[PDB]
Design a protein around this ligand. Structure first.
Ligand code: NA
Length: 153
């Protein structure tokens, strides 16, 4: 039950935090590492190695705070780092309305098998990137279905 409880708790933490930040137009960028190691990007951020919670994710992305300027990276059972760097995609197909967070989430999805969640600070929509593809402005049910299928083993 250990592995499943942690993965479900991760999904619930992402859902609750993203809902909180989308309601307040708080920009967020959360990348969940999988098979492809993301240690190179983890080292670019502030190390946390913290237990996963929605409360911590919310506190990290509060605007104009030391931990918010960058991406959160989740590795296994922990929030590995915050304010981490993610590479900007070169793709000209990404819409110009989308900001730097979507391009960074797209960029990391092109070079890793990670699942990255984006909360737009301009629109409040939640977006997903995976394998160089973008799911823009997903609903609560769509986000729940995608996270369950991808993050639960
Ligand atoms: Na486009």
């Amino acid at each position: 039950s250990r592995i499943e409880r942690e993965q479900h708790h991760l999904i619930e933490s992402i859902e609750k935090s993203t809902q909180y930040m989308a309601k307040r137009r708080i920009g967020a960028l959360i990348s969940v590492a999988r098979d492809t190691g993301m240690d190179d990007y983890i080292e670019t951020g502030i190390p946390l190695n913290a237990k996963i919670s929605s409360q911590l994710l919310i506190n990290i992305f509060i605007p104009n705070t030391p931990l918010h300027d960058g991406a959160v990276i989740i590795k296994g059972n922990e929030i590995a780092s915050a304010a981490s760097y993610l590479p900007l995609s070169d793709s000209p197909f990404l819409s110009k309305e989308l900001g730097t967070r979507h391009r960074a989430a797209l960029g990391i999805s092109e070079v890793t098998d990670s699942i990255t969640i984006v909360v737009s600070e301009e629109t409040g929509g939640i977006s997903l990137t995976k394998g160089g593809e973008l799911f823009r402005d997903v609903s609560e049910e769509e986000l729940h279905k995608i996270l369950l299928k991808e993050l639960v083993t």
